[PDB]
């Protein structure tokens, strides 16, 4: 049973070598992340040190823009849902129209009865959908108005702050992806450790096997 434990321990040796490789890889990754983030720090600081008033005055505009976008998505959803509701009502009424024109009669009766049982909830959903639609559109356009009057008084600031924020954005998504890489890589490393450990457990199992033999 010697070649068995031999091959086993060789395989786990390859495994722990792999572990070492992934460890060094991870360390290198994080060390790469750090320099990038501090670069982002100093560039952000220097660009703020360029013109601070423009940026600080620009922020409310971006705030209003975000709010307006949220209201946009909400209003869009409300509109779509209302459309679906309208379609549902259309079909539900078309059914009863045909059924009434007909006046296998039992099947027709059951069908029109189920339909005319569903049209009530249909109408309720219609009302809900349309009122929600109106509200959403209202808040929507209100936010658009405030954003407009904000854009009227911030033409000089936001243009200056635009490159700062786009740079900040690029560095943000970059460091984000980097951190992602670090995370999943470390996870895979842990899994590898699990594998190596499992090979060791096999070693213990065989060690238990032989002395019993």
Residue numbers in the entry: 41 to 143, 151 to 260
What does the paper say about this structure?
The Rab11 subfamily plays important roles in specific trafficking events such as exocytosis, endosomal recycling, and cytokinesis. SH3BP5 and SH3BP5-like (SH3BP5L) proteins have recently been found to serve as guanine nucleotide exchange factors (GEF) for Rab11. SH3BP5 exhibits a V-shaped structure comprising two coiled coils. The coiled coil composed of α1, and α4 is solely responsible for the Rab11a binding and GEF activity.
Because computational secondary structure prediction assigned the N- and C-terminal regions as mostly disordered regions, we selected the central helical region for crystallography. We found that the R260A/R261A/R262A triple mutation reduced the degradation and obtained diffraction-quality crystals. This construct of SH3BP5 (41–266; R260A/R261A/R262A) is hereafter referred to as SH3BP5-RA. In addition, the M167A mutation was introduced to improve the solubility of the selenomethionine (SeMet)-labeled SH3BP5-RA (SeMet SH3BP5-RA/M167A), which was used for phase determination by the single-wavelength anomalous diffraction method. Finally, we determined the crystal structures of SeMet SH3BP5-RA/M167A in two different crystal forms (I41 and P41) and native SH3BP5-RA at 3.35, 3.6, and 3.8 Å resolutions, respectively. The asymmetric units of the I41 and P41 crystals contain one and two SH3BP5 molecules, respectively. Therefore, we obtained five different apo-SH3BP5 structures in total (i.e., one from I41 SeMet SH3BP5-RA/M167A, two from P41 SeMet SH3BP5-RA/M167A, and two from P41 native SH3BP5-RA). Although these five apo-SH3BP5 structures exhibit a similar V-shaped conformation, the superposition of these five apo-SH3BP5 structures using α1 as the reference shows some flexibility of the conformation. The hinge region of the V shape contains staggered hydrophobic interactions so as to maintain the V shape.
